[PDB]
Design a protein around this ligand. Structure first.
Ligand code: ADP
Ligand code: ADP
Ligand code: ADP
Ligand code: ADP
Ligand code: ADP
Ligand code: ADP
Ligand code: RUB
Ligand code: RUB
Ligand code: RUB
Ligand code: RUB
Ligand code: RUB
Ligand code: RUB
Lengths: 286, 286, 286, 286, 286, 286
């Protein structure tokens, strides 16, 4: 070997098969998907470079709001990384701060370490990682977990990848207070969402996750709803959406229970109708 | 099975028998009772949907003032939930923050866990839950109880339902500081009551709970009392009501002891008369 | 039984015999004594009501200054309560915060619990109870004692009565910080004593407690003293009174030792004379 | 017995023999000595009253500056108290805060208790007692010592007397923060000192304690010194006196070493001469 | 021996062979290299002085930014020091604060001590040493590590050299708070890198460390980039450089993957082209 | 014996031989040396007084800047004290706060105590003692070391002398906060040095301690240097001097290494020349 065919590796790795898996398994967020397509390319090239004699550097940060594909992309990353020979067992260990820090004084270091043992050969995924740093609280022993984490991200490299994730404002603050992470994360990925279309996409995903469908009439009813809701006080984006869908679901349940034609099937029970949304006082004025 | 008769489940579950039990066992708060009627409908439908292949999501929050039916509705919920096959042993474990958090450093995690063991197959009911988060205090180890609680509400699902309850202002603040609860509570129920009529309803419920009745004359005497009391300093709503009723009870006891016609019966001993309320310095001016 | 003769219970209980015992054993504070007379009536009636099928609710708070009869009334309460079948062994366990909270981390819960064991069947009396809540101090474990106390006042009812006592300003603050006590205390009793007459009453009680009498001339000498003292800086009410009486006692002792007519009797040794008070620089101007 | 001869007890107790012992063993502070004479009288009378059927109340506070006779009066008190049958073994146990509070968490309660065991039948003397209350410091466990102390001063009475002593400003503050002491101290004794004569008395006592005498010429030299020193900045009363005497002693030593007539005797070595004081830059202007 | 030939020692030690090793193994930072050349001279002379009868004093501080040669110079120091007979086993033990301080209360002193055992006969290298002093955090036991460190730097001298390193602002602050280090460091070495040329040098070193080269066209493209970037908000110097190079690398990877002429060699894969930098929105205006 | 020949003791003790040792072993600071001469005289006399029947009082404080002879005088004191029979084994135990206070909670009292055991029969020397009082820090247990120290300085006297030393501003503050030390220190010794001449003396002592001499030309070069340096920002007195001498030493080493006439002797290697100082940018303007 002297040169390297990139497409040979791309087609030989099954990396394309994981990138396809990502398009199919994430309701269109092309922005992000392209960014992962691009990182795949770099990950490919870096590997081809390592195969011609030139340890990588892999850790990444995923920042954005709830419901932007952080977890489901992270899973695919572990895949991709296992397919490009960066990781041995391409498996994702997803953990919060409450899996790494123990209440008792000294029961944190074995806990982080053992979680790490389970992570080895794959990817550790620390959701809202910045919660490990709580000097707000006394008797929270999260600084030890940081120390052990930080030490691992520099030293014990070739057998682990770490992904910190969560809100960006909170992550960037976490790096201020705990530097040495910025230099250890090679991949900062922003997960963007909200515009009406985005809020509607969210509404749609939420309903897919619950196995409910809207009737076309109800879809337009929601689009109306959203536009109005965003001009009323204390609009909470995604929360306001969950909340509307919750109340819609409650209304749909009562609509059906009160009708009672007789037996009804999955479509009748999975469908949110125009009535269920338009009955909201959001359409009255509040 | 292909369609599902909802009324068949509603009548087969005995869910109606628990909803009747609620009307009979809660002095009219039709507002709330309708909201529970409605949630019952959704809980019904969701179940019928789970029975056609489409884990639920059950936790709820009860917000409002003291004396609005939070506990007595929660009890009925545990019933309803057991009747709709969501819960195995339909029993309510009611706990405050002082049942989950221990003084000693590490004697909290076994305590929360064991309470949880007692809760399993039924409903855990955390009154004024927001008191678990006390970063105001040092040496209070309530954050561990939150961690264990939060972990349970996501992971170990199909064998427990949690109801956080208490004042709304304090609950919404608690979610700010401890997010991840908002997404875990599927049912936000507001318990409304204060207007004179509400204060009078409260007075009425308090007296029912103690087995005392008022004479019509005394009722109007209280309505007079309330209107005056609310314009005097340090009006404490429900507390001022308990306090007036306490003093009325004391006056009624002394009225009866001092009269002493001879023997007297349950009505004489259960009745608060016009004298007992009007004797208050609230009618003098203070 | 269908009706109930109240006087039959009042005379059968020996409750009157304890109320007489109170008049005889408390230098006239008719205000309070009437309030206890009245509570007795209610306690009577409530009992007669429980005997016709209609658990009581018994805990109380005693608020006021040192030397108003809190302890000596509490003792009689335990009596009264035992005579009306509310309490099994009518005995009063009087405790401060230093009997419930231990220095060591975890040596508080057995200590509160064991004190409670000694209290069972009678009345526990927590003097200046608000001292259990010291978040001012670190390493004071008083919050656990509160938790155990609070739990007992709701759950393990029919075998214990609790009386919190002390200054009112401090008690009401204690309820702010630790709510759930207000609802558990059914009896708020205020112990009143300052106006000149009150200061003089205090002076009088203090001297009774020490077995000293004043000569009429000395009484008027004190009334003069008080009026002057209250217009001088740093007037501390009751403390200033103790302090004057202390100095009077010292002067009386030296008056007698220096005279030495020969032997002298109890009256000579128990009497504070006009000289003993008027010799004060309070009469000179300071 | 019906009356009581006071002089009989005063002469029979040997109380006079301890009061004489006080005059002889305290360089004239007649102010204080009279106050102790007076307290003796009251202590006498109270005893004669207890002997005619009318538990005492004994604890006291000694406030003032260093070098006013607090300790040497306290010793005599223990005497007096043993002679008037208030105390069984008339012995004084003198302790600071560092004898009652231990560093380790829980090694304070046995330490206070054992000190107290040694105190029993006599007088415990807590110098600068207010140092037991250090909420300024964390990991100081002085509040437990307060609790145990306070409990002893009310409950276990007839076998112990406590004397808190030290600066008055600091003592009165200590009572603010720890009330319940004011009511437990029956004897507040102020120890007054400074006027030139007092500063000179102090100088004199200091030199007696060290076995040094001044020559009459040097005495007048000091009186000159004092008057000047008090008008220069940062005058520290007693400290400035120690400091002058220290420097005088140093000068006297060098005066003698440099002279060296031959052998010299106790007078030559015990004497501070006019040279030793007048050589001070205080006489130059600084 | 009477005089000493310095060049004899310089050539006999192999000290020159380590200084050559430094030029070859550190991409030109002549500023620093001269400072190390100079220190070598002094270290030489001091040794020649010790060999004529006149314990040295060796500890040093390395201050500057990431990527200025601190570690790679420290390694050579250990060499040099071993070649001039100051150190027995010329080996460098590189440690952070997380290797010296343990979470548990008392598991720090054995940990520092054992690290020190491994350090003996060579050089201990504490990166960002100032992190040992964290009074910001409770339950961090770093002050003990300071104590043990400080004690070693004075007492147990002839068998250890310590090098504290990191940012200068943070180091000088660390000396304020922990004095006694300034007197123990005999060698303060500043590591300089920002001016455009410096930022470009940094960019260059970063790319060397990653095995990437720029085409001359791309170099000028970066110089353009830098000048623009420094006038846009939140310019973070070196971070902004890493960030640009990261994004350039990502663009280079995608440029190559998308072209796909066929096989490509190390130069094609190591080269960042003009396209990869100029594609930045920094050239659009943001 | 009746009188006492002082010169007999002075010549018999070998006290003169230690005072000579002080002149020879401290580069002229006649001010201090006279003060120690004088204290010797007093220590002599006090001893002669104790030998004629009239426990001493020995502890002292040494205040001043770094480099004024505190340690080297303290050593001689231990000598002197052993020669005048005040101390049994005339040996000096020199300790900082980091030798008395342990990190762990309770590992301070054995540590202070054992250090004290090593001190017994000689002098304990606490450098910068005021660092034992750190209420600035939590989890520093220095107050216990104070307690044990303070207790020793009063009680266990005849087998230990304590010397607190360091900056005066910081010492006097330490006495404010921890009184009872002022009365326990019988000897306050001020160590004076800064004026140009003093800075030059310091420079001179520093160079003696390192075995370097200046050429007369270089001395005047330093005097020039000092005058300029003190008018430039952040002048740090003694530190600026060390720093200049360090850089001079570095320059001298490089001057010699670069010349290389051939062999060179101790004078050439010990000498700092005019070149080595004048090459400083302090002479350029910065
Ligand atoms: N891009 C997406 N495509 C499909 N579903 C999504 C997407 N993003 C979020 N969701 C839905 O919202 C939930 C949020 O998932 P997650 O990745 O864990 O969020 P986070 O951004 O906090 O990491 C998912 O379980 C899923 O049901
Ligand atoms: N809605 C209601 N209907 C009948 N009684 C009520 C109602 N609300 C409150 N009460 C009375 O007041 C008490 C308050 O009960 P609870 O549910 O525990 O209050 P919360 O949960 O809001 O703190 C009840 O035990 C009952 O006696
Ligand atoms: N109402 C009263 N009648 C007679 N003596 C009283 C009365 N109140 C207080 N005293 C006297 O003052 C003391 C104060 O007693 P206590 O009841 O324990 O005070 P408190 O409970 O208010 O703290 C009593 O021991 C008693 O000698
Ligand atoms: N009234 C006094 N008569 C004789 N000596 C005194 C007197 N007051 C103080 N001293 C001297 O000063 C020292 C201070 O003693 P002490 O009673 O302990 O002071 P404090 O007021 O702090 O309790 C004594 O040991 C003694 O040498
Ligand atoms: N002077 C230099 N010469 C060549 N490469 C350097 C130099 N300084 C830094 N680097 C590069 O940057 C990285 C920073 O290394 P390091 O010395 O550990 O940083 P620091 O000690 O300043 O924290 C090195 O691994 C190296 O690849
Ligand atoms: N008076 C002095 N005479 C000679 N050398 C001194 C003198 N003062 C300081 N030094 C030098 O400086 C160092 C400072 O010593 P030290 O007594 O420990 O200072 P300090 O006690 O004031 O902190 C000494 O070891 C010595 O080399
Ligand atoms: O509180 C909200 C919604 O808050 P959010 O913006 O969080 O949804 C009100 O608009 C509803 O109570 C009205 O319900 P309905 O629309 O059924 O009347
Ligand atoms: O303190 C209150 C009532 O407070 P609250 O508002 O909490 O009831 C006074 O009005 C009563 O003491 C009067 O009693 P009465 O009315 O019997 O004179
Ligand atoms: O300090 C006080 C009294 O304070 P309080 O107001 O607390 O009593 C002075 O008036 C007395 O010292 C005078 O005593 P006499 O009156 O014997 O001179
Ligand atoms: O510091 C002081 C005294 O302080 P204090 O007021 O505390 O004594 C100066 O007056 C002395 O140094 C002078 O000594 P001398 O008088 O021997 O010159
Ligand atoms: O956030 C930054 C860079 O921050 P930093 O200054 O830290 O690099 C934006 O300029 C980029 O998102 C633009 O990327 P591109 O230049 O590829 O559009
Ligand atoms: O930082 C300082 C000195 O600080 P300090 O005042 O602490 O010495 C500069 O003057 C030197 O870098 C110049 O060195 P040179 O004089 O060799 O150029």
């Amino acid at each position: 070997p002297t040169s390297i065919d990139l497409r040979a590796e791309y087609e030989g790795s099954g990396a394309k098969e994981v990138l396809e898996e990502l398009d199919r398994e994430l309701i269109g967020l092309k922005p992000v998907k392209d960014r992962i397509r691009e990182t795949a390319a770099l990950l490919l090239v870096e590997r081809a470079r390592q195969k011609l004699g030139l340890t990588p550097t892999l850790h990444m940060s995923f920042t954005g709001n709830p419901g932007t594909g952080k977890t489901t992309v992270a899973l695919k990353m572990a895949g991709l990384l296992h397919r490009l020979g960066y990781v041995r067992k391409g498996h994702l260990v997803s953990v919060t701060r409450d899996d790494l820090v123990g209440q008792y004084i000294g029961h944190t270091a074995p806990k982080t370490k053992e979680v790490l043992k389970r992570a080895m050969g794959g990817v550790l995924f620390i959701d809202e990682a910045y919660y490990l740093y709580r000097p707000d609280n006394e008797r929270d022993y999260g600084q030890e977990a940081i120390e052990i984490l930080l030490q691992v991200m520099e030293n014990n490299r070739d057998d682990l990848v770490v992904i910190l994730a969560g809100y960006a404002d909170r992550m960037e603050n976490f790096f201020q207070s705990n530097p040495g992470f910025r230099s250890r994360i090679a991949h900062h990925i922003e997960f963007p969402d909200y515009s009406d279309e985005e809020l509607f996409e969210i509404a749609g995903h939420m309903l897919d996750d619950q196995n409910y469908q809207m009737t076309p009439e109800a879809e337009t009813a929601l689009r109306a709803y959203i536009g109005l809701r965003r001009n009323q006080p204390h609009f909470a984006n995604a929360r306001s959406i969950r909340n509307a869908l919750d109340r819609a679901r409650l209304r749909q349940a009562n609509r059906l229970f009160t009708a009672s034609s007789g037996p009804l099937d999955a479509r009748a029970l999975s469908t949110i109708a125009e009535e269920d949304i338009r009955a909201s006082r959001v359409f009255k004025g509040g």
